[PDB]
Amino acid sequence: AYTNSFTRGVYYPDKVFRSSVLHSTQDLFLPFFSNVTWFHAIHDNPVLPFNDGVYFASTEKSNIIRGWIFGTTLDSKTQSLLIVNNATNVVIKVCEFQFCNDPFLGVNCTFEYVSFKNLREFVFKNIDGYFKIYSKHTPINLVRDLPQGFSALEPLVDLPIGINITRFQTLLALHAAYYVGYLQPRTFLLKYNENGTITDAVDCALDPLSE
Amino acid sequence: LTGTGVLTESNKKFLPFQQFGRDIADTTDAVRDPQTLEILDITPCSFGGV
Numbered sequence A: 001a002y003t004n005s006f007t008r009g010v011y012y013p014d015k016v017f018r019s020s021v022l023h024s025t026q027d028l029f030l031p032f033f034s035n036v037t038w039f040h041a042i043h044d045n046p047v048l049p050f051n052d053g054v055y056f057a058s059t060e061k062s063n064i065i066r067g068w069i070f071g072t073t074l075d076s077k078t079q080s081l082l083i084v085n086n087a088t089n090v091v092i093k094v095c096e097f098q099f100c101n102d103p104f105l106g107v108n109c110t111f112e113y114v115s116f117k118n119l120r121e122f123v124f125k126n127i128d129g130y131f132k133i134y135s136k137h138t139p140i141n142l143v144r145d146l147p148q149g150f151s152a153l154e155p156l157v158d159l160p161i162g163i164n165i166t167r168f169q170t171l172l173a174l175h176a177a178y179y180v181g182y183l184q185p186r187t188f189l190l191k192y193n194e195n196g197t198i199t200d201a202v203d204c205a206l207d208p209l210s211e
Numbered sequence B: 001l002t003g004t005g006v007l008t009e010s011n012k013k014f015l016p017f018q019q020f021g022r023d024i025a026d027t028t029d030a031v032r033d034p035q036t037l038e039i040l041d042i043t044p045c046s047f048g049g050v
């Protein structure tokens, strides 16, 4: 399935506070009104490409989406990133795993680390050696789809893990719905409001009025 | 970040990940202190034409 992403997937591009300014930035962002591929927690866990970087989201009611996997081939020939959320812990690992043929969550290594009415949104990207995660949690008024309104994601972590990621997957809990979109290099104009909330943005390559 | 200025506490509500703030001229305009983790204003010390 496919659906329209609207103005979602903007995020704070650097660790610098700004306010009362319209700031031009060129970076990997989700293009406005782009097609996002759409999937369900019932029956639906295919492996997707990663390309330049992945916007990911899920519409939720009881915390069924609980992790992700990233790599080339997921088959112990090389490092693969694993991410899981479990109660008071958020957990990150990059050993040369072999996973299940059908992964789910039952209710030569280099690094390890530890920290519908819900919408959870994320951006996953790479910068040479470095993997970054950004996120937002919000209420939503309706089950239907991604909101036709604006909100900016904020950085969780940076991982110095250096993996050649070309594919990814997500993990479901078993005793919701989720989305995939691809970033592109876009010049953006970001509206940092009087408090430094990014309240709006223009995707400059969208249409002649945005240019 | 070497520079000359008056330092104060500020109304600049930095988000938890932010280390600095900047003016239009790229010059840093606030800093998080790396020890007490409070959000210092920077104002270049009082000056004007004579």
Ligand SMILES: *[C@@H]1O[C@H](CO)[C@@H](O[C@@H]2O[C@H](CO)[C@@H](O)[C@H](O)[C@H]2NC(C)=O)[C@H](O)[C@H]1NC(C)=O
Residues within 6 Å of the ligand: A072, A164, A166
């Ligand atoms: C990153 O992983 C990809 C595979 O997912 C590698 O791309 C292949 O590289 C070989 C040569 O090494 C080519 O013959 C194939 O045509 C490539 N396939 C694709 C889909 O591009 C890539 O080389 C890896 N890079 C590093 C630095 O590990």
Ligand SMILES: *[C@@H]1O[C@H](CO)[C@@H](O)[C@H](O)[C@H]1NC(C)=O
Residues within 6 Å of the ligand: A002, A004, A033, A034, A035
């Ligand atoms: C979204 O994808 C479908 C094919 O899956 C295509 O027909 C349609 O034109 C696309 N719409 C937009 C807004 O890109």
Ligand SMILES: *[C@@H]1O[C@H](CO)[C@@H](O)[C@H](O)[C@H]1NC(C)=O
Residues within 6 Å of the ligand: A084, A086, A087, A088, A089, A091
């Ligand atoms: C979370 O999972 C890890 C194993 O991946 C385990 O070591 C840790 O104790 C768990 N934490 C909680 C709060 O269950």
Ligand SMILES: *[C@@H]1O[C@H](CO)[C@@H](O)[C@H](O)[C@H]1NC(C)=O
Residues within 6 Å of the ligand: A108
């Ligand atoms: C670890 O790396 C070396 C090459 O640096 C290789 O010879 C060895 O077989 C690898 N070990 C495993 C268990 O993959």
Ligand SMILES: *[C@@H]1O[C@H](CO)[C@@H](O)[C@H](O)[C@H]1NC(C)=O
Residues within 6 Å of the ligand: A193, A195, A197, B013
């Ligand atoms: C701006 O920040 C103040 C607290 O510093 C808050 O009371 C106010 O609601 C905020 N306004 C907007 C538009 O974000």
Ligand SMILES: *[C@@H]1O[C@H](CO)[C@@H](O)[C@H](O)[C@H]1NC(C)=O
Residues within 6 Å of the ligand: B034, B035, B036
């Ligand atoms: C740095 O040291 C001071 C005491 O010299 C201490 O009060 C403060 O909490 C420390 N800050 C960090 C970030 O560890």
